[PDB]
């Protein structure tokens, strides 16, 4: 396991800073009663030889998902039983994920942009953009 090498690698924790996230959640067709708000969220991204791991956790929601990815290579995961296709790529120093949710005819853009000490995550679906800011853990 390697925890450095790219600016977006590391252990990231959500902050109080969030923008337009309910509009993004609504545009995905998800209920705000269970997916809105600003619950403490962790992103951990590290390298394991020939691939990366990306662990997402939302402890209040009993959610933990470990995503295995190789840059530029498609992968799949599941949420409940919604299949999710993804492909992570680098845009220079930033990390992007292209996400298909075929059952719902949705395409989602995720971006991870590290401004130094801080990580800005941008979420886009169609013309709806949300942002959330993360800090390095501890």
- Please give the residue ranges that form the binding site for Mg ion (CB under 5 A): 41
Q: What is the DSSP code string of 38-86?
A: ----EEEEEEETTEEEEEEEEGGGTEEEEEEE-TT--EEEEETTEEEEE
Nearest residue to Mg ion, using CB? Answer: 41
Q: Specify the residue, 105 or 138, whose C-beta has the smaller distance to Mg ion.
A: 138
Q: Specify the residue, 40 or 104, whose C-beta has the smaller distance to Mg ion.
A: 40
State in Å, rounded, how far the first CA of the chain is from the last one: 19
Nearest approach in angstroms of CB 121 to Mg ion is: 5
Nearest approach in angstroms of CB 82 to Mg ion is: 17
The C-alpha angle with vertex 42 and arms to 40 and 47, in degrees rounded to 5, equals: 180
The two structure tokens encoding residue 119? 């990580």
Nearest approach in angstroms of CB 60 to Mg ion is: 13
Q: Specify the residue, 62 or 105, whose C-beta has the smaller distance to Mg ion.
A: 62
Nearest approach in angstroms of CB 48 to Mg ion is: 21
Q: Specify the residue, 37 or 105, whose C-beta has the smaller distance to Mg ion.
A: 37
Rounded Cα gap, residues 28 and 57, in angstroms: 20
Q: What is the DSSP letter of 24?
A: H
């Amino acid at each position: 396991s390697e925890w450095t090498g790219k600016s977006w690698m590391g252990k990231w924790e959500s902050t109080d800073r969030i923008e337009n996230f309910d509009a993004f959640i609504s545009a995905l067709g998800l209920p705000l009663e269970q997916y809105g708000g600003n619950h403490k969220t962790f992103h951990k991204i590290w390298k394991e030889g020939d691939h990366y791991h990306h662990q997402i956790s939302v402890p209040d929601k009993n959610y933990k998902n470990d995503v295995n990815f190789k840059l530029n290579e498609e992968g799949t995961t599941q949420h409940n039983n919604t299949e999710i296709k993804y492909k992570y790529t680098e845009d220079g120093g930033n990390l992007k994920a292209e996400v298909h949710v075929p059952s719902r005819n949705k395409v989602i853009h995720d971006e991870y942009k590290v401004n130094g000490d801080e990580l800005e995550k941008t979420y886009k679906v169609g013309d709806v953009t949300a942002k959330r800011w993360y800090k390095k853990s501890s």
